[PDB]
């Protein structure tokens, strides 16, 4: 009843966070959902001597992710952070704080994403199958099948090297590609700090919520941070002026959290637009821009 005198602050904070939550799904739809049809790889995996077994999906896993995608998911130590269940377990006999149930008890929930990781893996599988079996032709319209050796001849003719270099050195190029994929596997199985960019995205969103939870113990100049103690120990003449400080401080902390989330959402949206550009121009085609996709001639 005291909070109703303030009014439309809570509604616009809810609208801002709802806009951010819709924008995350929009970013994930923009980056991955670029292909119209879910292509699948042929059952025979002889692509001109090139070995794609470590990036193509693995049917042995329950979730159809590749080997390198499994390493990438294992290196990021993402916590629970909601996204599944997280109620009833808090009512259950864990008998611990758990750092997530306290936010759920305090009105701070975490919504799950619209696209699950199986569906993102199916998008990446479709993009990989289209790139392998059709080159850039599936980005401009219907997919046109082409052998991978002549696709590599197209890729060499793009960068200014005649295609006779490829057909005289095809086995050596295939061996170098397989060695580079093996070096990627050796790089991802030892250094867990390579994926620090995504770990910062996890850590900032955990840390801001922990700060917002821990800010409720502050008094903001009042006699107590406990809400019921001011009501019980004082009458209505000065309890309202003591709890107005608490309401002002908590509302200002909520506004600070929403402002920082808006700035971080703008930064994440810029990075997602860059990722969508790199998917459109380098996966679905060949890029002539210098240092846009890897050092050297792309």
Ligand X SMILES: *[C@@H]1O[C@H](CO)[C@@H](O)[C@H](O)[C@H]1NC(C)=O
Ligand Y SMILES: *[C@@H]1O[C@H](CO)[C@@H](O[C@@H]2O[C@H](CO)[C@@H](O)[C@H](O)[C@H]2NC(C)=O)[C@H](O)[C@H]1NC(C)=O
Which residues are at the interface with ligand Y (CB under 6 A)? 51, 53-54
Upper half-sphere CA count for residue 50 (Cβ side, 13 Å):
19
Q: Which stretch binds other proteins (CB under 8 A): 63-71, 73-81, 131-139, 196-204?
A: 131-139
141 contacts which partner out of ligand Y, ligand X, other proteins, none, CB within 5 to 8 A by kind? Answer: other proteins
Confirm if 21 and 111 have CB atoms less than 8 A apart: yes
Nearer to ligand X, 46 or 193 (CB): 46
CA-to-CA distance for 89 and 87, rounded, in angstroms? 5
CA-to-CA distance for 286 and 298, rounded, in angstroms? 7
- Min CB(12)–other proteins separation in Å: 6
- Nearest residue to ligand X, using CB? 85
Upper half-sphere CA count for residue 177 (Cβ side, 13 Å):
16
Nearer to other proteins, 126 or 212 (CB): 126
Confirm if 13 and 254 have CB atoms less than 8 A apart: yes
- Does position 147 bind other proteins by CB under 8 A? yes
Q: Which stretch binds other proteins (CB under 8 A): 56-64, 109-117, 183-191, 225-233?
A: 109-117
CA-to-CA distance for 266 and 87, rounded, in angstroms? 31
144 contacts which partner out of ligand Y, other proteins, ligand X, none, CB within 5 to 8 A by kind? Answer: other proteins
- Min CB(44)–ligand X separation in Å: 6
CA-to-CA distance for 30 and 24, rounded, in angstroms? 10
> Which residues within the stretch 238-277 sit at the binding site for other proteins (CB under 8 A)?
240-241, 244, 252, 255, 259, 262-263, 266, 270
- Residue 41 φ then ψ, to 5°: -75, 150
Point out which residues bind ligand X (CB under 6 A).
44, 46, 85
């Amino acid at each position: 009843n005291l909070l109703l005198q303030y009014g439309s602050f809570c509604t616009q904070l809810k609208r801002a966070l709802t806009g951010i939550a819709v924008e995350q799904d929009k970013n994930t739809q923009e980056v991955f959902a670029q292909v119209k049809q879910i292509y699948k790889t042929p059952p025979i995996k002889y692509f001109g001597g090139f070995n794609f077994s470590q990036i193509l999906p693995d049917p042995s896993k329950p979730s159809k992710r590749s080997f390198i995608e499994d390493l990438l998911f294992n290196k990021v130590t993402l916590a629970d952070a909601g996204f599944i269940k997280q109620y009833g377990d808090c009512l259950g006999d864990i008998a611990a704080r758990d750092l997530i149930c306290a936010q759920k008890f305090k009105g701070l929930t975490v919504l799950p994403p619209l696209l699950t990781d199986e569906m993102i893996a199916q998008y990446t599988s479709a993009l990989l199958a289209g790139t392998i079996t059709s080159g850039w032709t599936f980005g401009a319209g219907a997919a046109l099948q082409i052998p991978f050796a002549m696709q590599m001849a197209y890729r060499f003719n793009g960068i200014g090297v005649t295609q006779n270099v490829l057909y005289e050195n095809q086995k050596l190029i295939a061996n170098q590609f397989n060695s580079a994929i093996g070096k990627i596997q050796d790089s991802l199985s030892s250094t867990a700090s390579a994926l620090g960019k995504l770990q910062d995205v996890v850590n900032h969103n955990a840390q801001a919520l922990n700060t917002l939870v821990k800010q409720l113990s502050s008094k903001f100049g009042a006699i107590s941070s406990v809400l019921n103690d001011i009501f019980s120990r004082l009458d209505k003449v000065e309890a309202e002026v003591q709890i107005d400080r608490l309401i002002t401080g908590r509302l200002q902390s909520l506004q600070t959290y929403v402002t920082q989330q808006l700035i971080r959402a703008a930064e994440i949206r810029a990075s997602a637009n860059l990722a969508a550009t790199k998917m459109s121009e380098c996966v679905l085609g060949q890029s002539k821009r210098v240092d846009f996709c890897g050092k050297g001639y792309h």
